Design a protein around this ligand. Structure first.
Ligand SMILES: COc1ccc(CNS(=O)(=O)c2ccc(S(N)(=O)=O)s2)cc1
Ligand SMILES: [Hg+2]
Ligand SMILES: [Zn+2]
Length: 257
């Protein structure tokens, strides 16, 4: 149905998902000069040492690495959050060129890609219940800039060949998500939504100030994925990002000065 093409892209989404024009839609532009430093903000607590990755799959929109979330194995706490949020999956959004790809922008600046680590609030029992709550999900957004290779990313880059087309999956166990984190945990935070349909407004966004760098060849391999299924006409998976949405009645808080 929906996609990122001229005929089914972001500009058409509202027809099937009216919330597209809601009050707390993501992503947004982070204007650094008007974001408010909040000293009551606690530091983030990322406990990914017991993370259990299971699979990687191309869902026709991006590739997602899924984790075992049956127990508190990889959780996010602290920051603007109240409660424990479990990591369920992470995916990327990237562009056809190095100067675009991220969904959130900083002072209108676009990065080559953006990593989203999706977590759901454990007080709600399961992910499905979490998506029915204003504080159900917490997504950690990390910008990727092209530069030196990211060692922790290569394992992911190496398996892309086997999940070239939509619907394909591959076992992807023992992957450590900690290799994808920048050195600093400083962040911006604001209430938002999922950036793809159903565009549910259940997300507390936490965007890290510090981006990680990846090589030209690493992001290049992202661009060789296919939106289409096997046997269908080939369509390269690129520019799977949604444009910035109006901030409206929201303010972006910064954990740093
Ligand atoms: C049945 O109810 C639902 C509710 C939500 C989904 C979306 N799936 S999802 O949570 O993995 C995400 C989609 C986009 C994400 S972004 N780019 O904002 O981080 S996270 C599926 C079924
Ligand atoms: Hg919600
Ligand atoms: Zn995303």
């Amino acid at each position: 149905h929906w996609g990122y093409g001229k005929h089914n892209g972001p500009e058409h989404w509202h027809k099937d998902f009216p919330i597209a024009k809601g009050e707390r839609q993501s992503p947004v532009d982070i204007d650094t000069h008007t974001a408010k430093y909040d000293p009551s903000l606690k530091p983030l607590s990322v406990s990914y040492d017991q993370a259990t990755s299971l699979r990687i799959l191309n869902n026709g929109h991006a590739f997602n690495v899924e984790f075992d979330d049956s127990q508190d194995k990889a959780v996010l706490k602290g920051g603007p959050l109240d409660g424990t949020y479990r990591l369920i999956q992470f995916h990327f959004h990237w562009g056809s060129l190095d100067g675009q790809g991220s969904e959130h922008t900083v002072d209108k600046k676009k990065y080559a890609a953006e990593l989203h680590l999706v977590h759901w609030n454990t007080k709600y029992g399961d992910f499905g219940k979490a998506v029915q709550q204003p504080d159900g999900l917490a997504v950690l957004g990390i910008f990727l800039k092209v530069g030196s290779a990211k060692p922790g990313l290569q394992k992911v880059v190496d398996v892309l060949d086997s999940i070239k087309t939509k619907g394909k999956s591959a076992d992807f166990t023992n992957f450590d998500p900690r290799g994808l984190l920048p050195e600093s945990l400083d962040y911006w935070t604001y209430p938002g939504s999922l950036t793809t349909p159903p565009l549910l407004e259940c997300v507390t966004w936490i965007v890290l100030k510090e981006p990680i760098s990846v090589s030209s060849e690493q992001v290049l391999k992202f661009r060789k994925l296919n939106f289409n299924g096997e046997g269908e006409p080939e369509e390269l998976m690129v520019d799977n990002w949604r444009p910035a949405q109006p901030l409206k009645n929201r303010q972006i808080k910064a954990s740093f000065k």
